[PDB]
Structure formats: C-alpha cells, structure tokens
Amino acid sequence: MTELKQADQIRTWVQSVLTGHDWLHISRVADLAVYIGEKENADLFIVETAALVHDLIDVKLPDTIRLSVSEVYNQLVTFGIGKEDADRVIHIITKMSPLSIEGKVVQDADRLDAIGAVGIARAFMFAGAKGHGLYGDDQSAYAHFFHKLLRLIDMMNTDTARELAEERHEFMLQYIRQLEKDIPGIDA
Amino acid sequence: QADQIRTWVQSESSGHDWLHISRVADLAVYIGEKENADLFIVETAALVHDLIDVKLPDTIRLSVSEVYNQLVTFGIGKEDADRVIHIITKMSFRDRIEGKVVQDADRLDAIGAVGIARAFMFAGAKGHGLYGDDQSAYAHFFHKLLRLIDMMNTDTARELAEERHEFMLQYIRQLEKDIPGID
Ligand SMILES: Nc1ncnc2c1ncn2[C@@H]1O[C@H](COP(=O)(O)OP(=O)(O)O)[C@@H](O)[C@H]1O
Ligand SMILES: Nc1ncnc2c1ncn2[C@@H]1O[C@H](COP(=O)(O)OP(=O)(O)O)[C@@H](O)[C@H]1O
Ligand code: NI
Ligand code: NI
Numbered sequence: 148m149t150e151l152k153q154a155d156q157i158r159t160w161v162q163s164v165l166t167g168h169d170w171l172h173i174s175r176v177a178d179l180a181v182y183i184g185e186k187e188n189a190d191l192f193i194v195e196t197a198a199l200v201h202d203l204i205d206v207k208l209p210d211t212i213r214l215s216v217s218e219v220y221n222q223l224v225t226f227g228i229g230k231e232d233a234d235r236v237i238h239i240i241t242k243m244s245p246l247s248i249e250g251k252v253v254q255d256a257d258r259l260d261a262i263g264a265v266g267i268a269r270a271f272m273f274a275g276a277k278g279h280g281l282y283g284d285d286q287s288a289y290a291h292f293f294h295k296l297l298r299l300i301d302m303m304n305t306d307t308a309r310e311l312a313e314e315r316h317e318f319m320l321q322y323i324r325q326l327e328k329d330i331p332g333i334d335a
Numbered sequence: 336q337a338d339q340i341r342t343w344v345q346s347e348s349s350g351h352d353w354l355h356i357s358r359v360a361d362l363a364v365y366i367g368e369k370e371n372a373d374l375f376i377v378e379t380a381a382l383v384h385d386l387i388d389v390k391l392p393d394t395i396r397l398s399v400s401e402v403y404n405q406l407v408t409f410g411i412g413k414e415d416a417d418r419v420i421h422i423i424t425k426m427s428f429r430d431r432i433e434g435k436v437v438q439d440a441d442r443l444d445a446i447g448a449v450g451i452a453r454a455f456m457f458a459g460a461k462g463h464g465l466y467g468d469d470q471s472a473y474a475h476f477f478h479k480l481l482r483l484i485d486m487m488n489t490d491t492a493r494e495l496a497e498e499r500h501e502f503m504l505q506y507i508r509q510l511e512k513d514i515p516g517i518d
Contacts, residue, residue: 171467175514264509268465268472271452275459278348281452288452318509325448325502330358 149227150192154199156226161199164212167269168202172260176201179311180256184249186307193232193249196223197239201253205244216241246304255308258299263315266296267322282326282333289333292323337378339409344382347395350457351385355444363440369491372433376415379406380422380437388427399424439492442483447499450480451506466517473517476507 158177162170177198184194200223203214216237223233239250246254261269274281274288282289300316303309327333341360345353363381367374383406386397399420406416422434426441444450458465458472466473481503484496511517 169464171465178515263513264506265465265513267451267506268455268510271455272459272465272472275348275456276462278460280352281354281449281456283354288456315513322448322451322506326452329447329449329499 153227154192154195157196157199157223160222160226161203164203164214167273168205168207172269173199173202175265176253176256176260179259180253183256183305183307183311184252187248187252187305189249189252193235193239194252196228196232197236197249197253198256200236201240201243201257204240251304252308255304258302259308259311259315262296262299262312263318264322266315267319270296282330289326292319297323336410337375337382340379340382340406343405343409344386347391348460349390349392350453350460351388351391355453356382356385358449359437359440359444362443363437366440366489366491366495367433367436370432370436370489372436373415373418376418376422376433377436379411379415380419380433381440383419384423384426384437384441387423389429435488436492439488442486443492443495443499446480446483446496447502448506450499451503454480466514473510476503 158174161173165173177195180194180198181191183189184191200219202208203219204216205213219240220233220237223236224230228236235247235249239247239253242250243254243257260266270291271281271288273279274291280287284290285294296319297316300309300312303312341357344356347353360378360381363377364374366372367377383402385391386395386402387399388396402423403416403420406419407413411419418433422437425431425434426438445453454472454475455465457463458475464471464473468474469478481500484493484500487493487496
C-alpha cells in the first residue's frame with residue numbers, strides 16, 4: 148500500500164529527528180491512536196501521521212530538534228502525502244499545540260499515555276528530570292496527579308478512548324491508595 | 336535532641352533526599368519498636384546514614400568523624416554515638432539489631448508504590464529510559480527491586496514487604512498492558 152510505505156517513511160524520519168517526548172512515547176501514541184481510530188471509523192492514515200509528527204513542533208522539544216510547521220508540511224509533501232492530507236495533518240498539530248475528528252483521536256491517545264502505569268512512570272521521570280519532589284509541594288509529582296492526571300479521563304473526546312481510560316484511571320487511583328498507605332500523611 | 340538532629344540533616348536529586356530520610360526514620364522507629372531495638376539509636380542512625388554514603392556527591396558527603404563529632408556536640412553519649420557510627424559505616428561502604436531495622440526501613444522505601452516512584456524519579460534524574468535498556472527503570476525492577484523482599488532481616492519488615500512487593504507486581508502487569516512489547 149502507498150499508505151503503509153508512507154507511514155513507514157514518516158516513522159523512520161520521526162525516529163531520526165528525535166534521536167517525555169521521546170520516540171517510544173510517540174510510537175505508543177501512534178499505535179494507540181490507530182486502535183482508537185479504527186474503532187471510531189476515523190481516517191486511519193491521517194490519525195497515524197498526525198500522531199507520529201504531533202510533537203515535532205511542540206514548544207517542549209529542545210531547539211536542536213523542534214521543527215517549524217513549514218518544515219513538517221514540506222517533509223510530508225516530499226514524502227508523497229497529498230497537499231489535502233498534509234493540510235489536515237497540519238490543522239491537527241497546530242490546534243493541539245474545535246480540533247478535527249482525527250485530532251480528537253490523537254489528543255485522546257496522547258492523554259491515555261499520560262495516565263495508567265505508563266502515565267505514573269512518565270510523571271515521576273519528569274519530576275526527576277526537573278528536580279521536583281515526589282510529594283510535599285505544588286510543583287511535586289503527587290500534586291500533578293491531583294491538578295491534572297486524575298482529571299484526564301473527563302477530557303476524553305471519543306467513546307473508545309473513554310472506555311480505555313477507565314481501567315488506566317482506576318489503576319492510578321489504586322496507585323494513589325498504595326502511596327497513601329506506604330506514606331502516612333502524604334496529603335498534608 | 337532527635338529534633339536538633341532533624342534540623343541539621345535537613346541541611347538531593349539522587350534518591351537520597353530529605354523526604355526519603357524522614358520516611359525511613361519514621362519506618363525505622365516503627366519497626367524498631369516491634370523488634371525491641373533502641374528507638375533513639377534507630378532514629379538517629381536512620382537520620383544520618385546517607386550523610387557519609389559514597390553514592391552522595393563530594394560537595395555534600397561528610398566523613399565519619401564529622402558525623403560522630405557533630406552527634407557528640409548535640410549532646411549524645413559516647414555509648415550511643417559509637418553504636419550509631421557503627422550502624423552507618425556498616426551500611427555505607429563499597430560493595431556492602433538496630434542496624435537490621437535501619438537497613439530494612441531503607442530497603443522497604445525502595446519497594447511498593449513509593450519505590451516505583453523513586454525508581455522512575457531516579458531514571459528521570461540520570462536521563463535513563465523508562466524501558467528499553469539494561470540501564471532503564473523497568474530493568475531495575477528485575478535486577479534489584481523485586482528481590483528486595485528476600486533480603487529483609489526482621490519479621491516485621493518481611494510482613495510489610497509482602498503487600499509492597501505484591502503491589503509492584505500489579506504495577507508491572509499494568510505496565511505490560513499499557514506498553515505491549517515492553518520486554
Ligand atoms: N508538573 C509535572 N509533574 C510531573 N509530571 C509532569 C508534569 N507536567 C507534565 N508531566 C508529565 O511529563 C510528560 C511530558 O509532559 P509535557 O512535556 O509537560 O507535556 P506533553 O507531553 O503533553 O507535551 C507527561 O506524561 C506529563 O504527564
Ligand atoms: N538503575 C536504576 N534504575 C532506577 N532506579 C534506581 C536504579 N538504581 C537505583 N535506583 C533507585 O534510587 C534509589 C537509591 O538507590 P541507590 O543509591 O542505588 O541505593 P541506596 O541509596 O539504598 O544505597 C532507590 O529508590 C533505587 O531503587
Ligand atoms: Ni505527546
Ligand atoms: Ni537511603
């Protein structure tokens with residue numbers, strides 16, 4: 148398939164460019180976005196392509212790596228993606244940083260990778276990276292569960308992503324419960 | 336007196352932070368009560384053991400004598416100063432009843448939900464992967480964390496370790512659902 152080859156092209160590029168926004172996160176989010184897209188009857192090629200390049204423009208990437216919108220667009224077109232599809236992908240990644248149907252799917256997959264056991268891991272790695280405490284202040288990893296991560300299930304766009312988020316969100320709840328036991332007074 | 340030690344020791348992005356020390360002193364003190372240890376010794380040794388650790392950097396790392404002489408200055412007896420110094424030197428060298436308790440407290444804080452957290456904080460602080468290397472957080476579970484339960488000295492610690500260990504397995508199972516092909 149033209150599309151399979153183009154997906155593969157995009158994957159190698161994205162991996163090359165990038166090598167909590169590492170290739171492994173992007174690859175997980177692409178796989179998850181395609182699964183949700185399939186269930187949701189969204190356009191699979193747009194979902195996967197947007198999922199793969201969504202972080203390339205993100206203000207969080209260091210400046211040796213981060214791309215301009217025109218750089219992503221030109222690379223897509225060079226790789227054989229029609230201008231119309233390329234426009235749609237561009238619409239999604241710029242909105243992400245009403246989102247389109249496929250944009251909502253990608254956003255959902257992205258938020259799913261921020262919850263469950265994976266999201267817990269990513270949260271504590273971030274805290275470790277930025278020199279924040281495990282708990283004890285408003286910049287802490289534990290605070291971030293309450294400010295953000297535990298609310299993500301309410302922000303899911305699709306039924307499919309809402310269904311997947313349930314088990315992950317409940318698992319974060321079990322994780323918080325275990326921290327409350329391992330560490331009496333953690334909340335105060 | 337234990338209050339004057341808690342102020343000084345408070346005065347680290349490596350896994351040897353204050354919250355960990357404070358956690359482990361409270362745990363040590365709890366375990367020590369069950370295992371009939373000298374609670375003042377346990378709390379003090381728990382509070383100061385990391386100060387001389389070779390894993391702690393040069394800019395912070397204190398010498399044994401500095402720890403001894405600071406303790407004596409806060410007004411500790413020679414008896415208890417020697418016992419504490421005994422404990423913290425036995426724990427802290429390269430290729431490492433009151434010591435057992437302090438060691439158990441320390442190990443326990445490396446497992447369960449809390450240990451998961453510190454492992455990932457560690458991997459983040461040193462720039463290591465979530466998974467994929469032998470140097471990754473996920474690898475450390477199998478290399479170290481999942482076998483800590485079988486290195487516990489006291490009955491009390493062994494019992495506490497069970498639920499923490501079982502939870503780490505639940506965590507790892509969820510992670511394998513979240514990340515297909517993580518192995
Ligand atoms: N204040 C915080 N404390 C702990 N983890 C965080 C914090 N902010 C973001 N994270 C986590 O770090 C990862 C990277 O997030 P970030 O780069 O800030 O936004 P995004 O990944 O959505 O572009 C995500 O899993 C996110 O949940
Ligand atoms: N390779 C690793 N990956 C993830 N976490 C680690 C690794 N090595 C140590 N840690 C974590 O950092 C903390 C401190 O461990 P370490 O300094 O090795 O032993 P100790 O402090 O008990 O002498 C612990 O929570 C431990 O699990
Ligand atoms: Ni992302
Ligand atoms: Ni320690």
